[PDB]
């Protein structure tokens, strides 16, 4: 009964691992089930250590495979992904449908959060719409995922202490309870606290400041510290920005940026990284180059 679907799902995972897309209605079923799980997760997802934290993948499916060779196979190692699964790469489809397959198979072994790119408006331009189209004769697959994306949680809190986040802080938010009071079940707005969470950046400047990218604010050490102390946090973990070293500390290690897509769009030449948080929440980084072809 459930065991029949468990093994149906195991094969979907075997298959995706060979970079082979599921079909339009297998995808449709996977997304109905995932909503059902995600609708139960809070905007600030309690996550327990140990767990490995990752950032932007942006459709680089062969590099995601490479990530698993570094950090180990799910479900053996627990994961937290901070979004940007989609757009830019050629395998945004294979890529997302794997990770949400994993979520549906292993509720408790993987957490997926919303990036700025899990948006109707952005996927329509940076490639995920067109990819879906090429690969499945029509727009439903895209419609099934972008409805799903609305149900993805905004933030995660690892062990009451480390705050995981795609983008960054918001001048509209002072506390985690401010975040849990939001309504996440909607397309990402062009402005507001929800927008900020998935668009903001850390800065060498002080205080707030407008983002150079057209949405959300920038923020300085002074802001990081205020917010952390206020909420009792060791650290803010985030993605969103390409960093050449794969990870990058700032604001006196109140903030770290993790970017998990090596050689972004075959040009940028960065490395990728993931952060392992062991059994007692102590950090450790693994840097990697892209998979050879």
């Amino acid at each position: 009964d459930e065991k029949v679907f468990t093994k149906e799902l195991d094969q979907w995972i075997e298959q995706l691992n060979e970079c082979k897309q599921l079909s339009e209605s297998q995808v449709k079923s996977l997304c109905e089930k995932a909503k059902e799980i995600l609708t139960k997760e809070s905007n600030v997802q309690e996550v327990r250590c140990p767990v490995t934290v990752c950032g932007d993948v942006h459709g680089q499916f062969h590099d995601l495979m490479e990530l698993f060779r570094i950090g180990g196979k799910s479900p053996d190692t627990n994961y937290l992904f901070m979004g940007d699964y989609v757009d830019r790469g050629y395998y945004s489809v294979e890529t997302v449908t794997l990770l949400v397959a994993l979520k549906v198979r292993y509720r408790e072994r993987i957490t997926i959060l919303r990036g700025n790119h899990e948006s109707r408006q952005i996927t329509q331009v940076y490639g995920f719409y067109d990819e879906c189209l090429r690969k499945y004769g029509n727009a439903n697959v895209w419609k099934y995922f972008t409805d799903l994306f609305d149900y993805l949680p905004l933030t995660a809190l690892v062990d009451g202490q480390i705050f995981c986040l795609h983008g960054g802080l918001s001048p509209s938010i002072d506390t985690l309870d401010h975040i849990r009071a939001l309504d996440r079940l909607q397309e990402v707005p062009h402005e507001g606290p929800m927008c900020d969470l998935l668009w903001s950046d850390p800065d060498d400047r002080g205080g707030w400041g407008i983002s150079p990218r057209g949405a959300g604010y920038t923020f300085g050490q002074d802001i990081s510290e205020t917010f952390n102390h206020a909420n009792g946090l060791t650290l803010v973990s985030r993605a969103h920005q390409l960093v050449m070293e794969g990870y990058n500390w700032c604001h006196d290690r109140n903030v770290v940026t993790i970017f998990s897509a090596p050689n972004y769009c075959y040009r940028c030449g960065n490395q990728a990284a993931i952060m392992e948080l062991d059994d007692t929440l102590k950090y450790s980084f693994l840097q990697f180059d892209p998979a050879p072809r």
């Binding site: 970079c19 690969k135 075959y266």
Partner: protein
């Protein structure tokens, strides 16, 4: 097994039809006309009595040798439609057997001329073209190219019943009477498409010899295509026989194929066309040597334009991701068709219009 496996091979076909009822309808129709002789003006009515779309009128009239005197007799018309009906059990077979040279059983570029001559003289949306003229003749060549581009997927000069059956061509012949704006039939007969194609050719062929060369073609779209790609059009990779290689010159007809391929490279014919051009050695695979031979020139042009040209090795990795080749380190024609992104692959190696 003579019983259990009944005969599945039919030289002609299988089906049913009342051939005498039709001879009869033809007969009564021909009885409206002076001396029971149908004139080209009268052939709408005769096409309809035969159970055919209006625009089979030209081929039908032609088939019975009516163009010889300007009129055909009922006995002669009946004689040949009878033979069609007895031998040709579907639309595609009938159309071939009307236009074909005897013995052949296939259609050649010229076989389509009497059909198209009629479309031009008759169809509302082409009234302004009636006059015997340059644009008259060139529209006819162009449409024939477009028919062959889409229908004749084997690249033989010979359109076959099978190929016709497999295409959408006869549905467009059908739609001619229903659609008075010819531009709506975008697949073969669109005038506005032909206008673009001809003006593109006309601006390059400055001596108006109806023949174009590597230098001339290099000027198309502000030399958007690479020189190494251009010299490849004249190599024998996409044209028949010895002539083109000897004279470094292509006809208007050939330019139509070139241009339609440039316009849209996602298409199974276009992909064959450009693949032929890229497979420098003809071995059926695009070796890294063959790729680098093209990419080196893209690089120098990107340089001229002060753009950072992605280095070959980083490019090859991107291209191999984009096309998902079946067997590692070997790009084949089939791989290119499956991927849906053939056009970006091709542009990446020999086109600079972005930007």
């Amino acid at each position: 097994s003579s019983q259990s496996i009944p005969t599945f091979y039919f030289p002609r076909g299988r089906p049913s039809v009342n051939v005498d009822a039709v001879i009869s309808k033809i007969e009564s129709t021909f009885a409206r006309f002076p001396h029971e002789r149908a004139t080209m003006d009268d052939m709408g009515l005769v096409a309809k009595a035969c159970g055919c779309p209006l625009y089979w009128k030209g081929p039908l009239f032609y088939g019975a040798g009516g163009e010889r005197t300007g009129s055909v007799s009922v006995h002669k018309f009946v004689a040949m439609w009878r033979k069609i009906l007895q031998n040709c059990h579907d639309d595609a077979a009938k159309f071939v057997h009307l236009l074909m040279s005897p013995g052949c059983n296939y259609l050649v570029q010229e076989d389509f001329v009497p059909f198209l001559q009629d479309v031009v003289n008759t169809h509302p949306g082409l009234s302004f073209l009636k006059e015997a003229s340059e644009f008259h003749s060139r529209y006819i060549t162009t449409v024939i190219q477009r028919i062959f581009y889409a229908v004749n997927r084997s690249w033989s000069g010979r359109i076959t019943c099978a190929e016709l059956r497999r295409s959408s061509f006869l549905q467009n012949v059908a739609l001619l009477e229903e659609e008075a704006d010819i531009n709506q039939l975008t697949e073969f007969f669109s005038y506005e498409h032909f206008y673009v194609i001809y003006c593109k050719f006309w601006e390059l062929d400055t001596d108006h010899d109806l023949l174009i060369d590597a230098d001339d073609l290099a000027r198309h779209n502000d030399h958007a295509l690479s020189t190494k790609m251009i010299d490849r059009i004249f190599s024998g990779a996409v044209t028949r026989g010895r002539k083109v290689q000897k004279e470094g010159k292509i006809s208007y007809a050939d330019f139509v194929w070139f241009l339609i391929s440039e316009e849209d490279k996602k298409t199974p014919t276009s992909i064959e066309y450009w693949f032929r051009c890229m497979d420098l050695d003809g071995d059926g695979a695009l070796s890294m040597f063959e790729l680098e031979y093209f990419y080196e020139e893209q690089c120098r042009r990107l340089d001229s334009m002060a753009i950072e040209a992605l280095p070959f090795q980083d490019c090859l990795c991107q291209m191999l991701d984009l096309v998902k080749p079946r067997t590692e380190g070997k790009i084949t024609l089939q791989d290119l068709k499956r991927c849906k992104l053939a056009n970006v692959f091709f542009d990446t190696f020999f086109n600079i219009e972005k930007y």
